[PDB]
Design a protein around this ligand. Sequence first.
Ligand SMILES: Nc1ncnc2c1ncn2[C@@H]1O[C@H](COP(=O)(O)OP(=O)(O)OP(O)(O)=S)[C@@H](O)[C@H]1O
Length: 274
Amino acid sequence: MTTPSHLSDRYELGEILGFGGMSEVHLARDLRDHRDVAVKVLRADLARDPSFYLRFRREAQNAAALNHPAIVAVYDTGEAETPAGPLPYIVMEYVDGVTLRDIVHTEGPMTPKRAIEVIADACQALNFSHQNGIIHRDVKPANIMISATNAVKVMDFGIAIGTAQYLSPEQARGDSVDARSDVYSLGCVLYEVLTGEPPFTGDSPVSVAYQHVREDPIPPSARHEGLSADLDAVVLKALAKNPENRYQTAAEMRADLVRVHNGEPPEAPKVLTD
Ligand SMILES: Nc1ncnc2c1ncn2[C@@H]1O[C@H](COP(=O)(O)OP(=O)(O)OP(O)(O)=S)[C@@H](O)[C@H]1O
């Protein structure tokens, strides 16, 4: 039962842009500051459920505020009073565009050069985040948008619904996560934009986590054609089980992708098929 037409006598809501497991996101006009913004509101249909309300206040509303061209900026948080009860929200940079989850669904895999470019920009966002002490912690296709003018925008950093499909082996065992955990999860995203499939699927979330821990990904070139062995090398280094065997920074990952984009050999160890 509905999201109001206005929040805090300031954000006039327009069209709905999207939804997830917790939120509905609306295009709005900020009447104070004269800005188009995206307002993430607790889903109307879940808003009275204690567990979702409390998760929204703890998680979504505590998205990190970072200032980088490839990071969706966070402007504000608040809570509206409705006759149904409190409706919490977070106000952020409006991206006119779609998520990688959307793109992979509607178009299937990207050309390898596009995929490289997109993930290379995503590396720049993560490296900025990491230099400001913030680990993303939920790198996944739904958290990366491409704009109408083809800019890459990463969102929802630093938060403690959603899928084991992208978690690092260390998150699968509830351990310490660092920059290399972000690298692995971006590795998963890269695999999916290249092949159309994530590295691991399963009947359950505990089944996919098991595969992250114990099972080698099928090399990208085996799952989809037109993908070089140099691309296998970079993807499978990012996807290494031991953090010490992965790219140690997002910058180091980007550098290998830049080599491959330029037709240079990557520094990652060779992977042999067939
Ligand atoms: N800043 C943004 N600008 C434009 N659209 C956005 C923006 N952020 C989110 N969206 C759209 O709204 C959708 C839902 O946002 P999500 O962050 O995935 O939802 P959520 O419910 O808070 O997250 P989980 O991960 O599902 S619990 C996205 O898939 C986009 O379609």
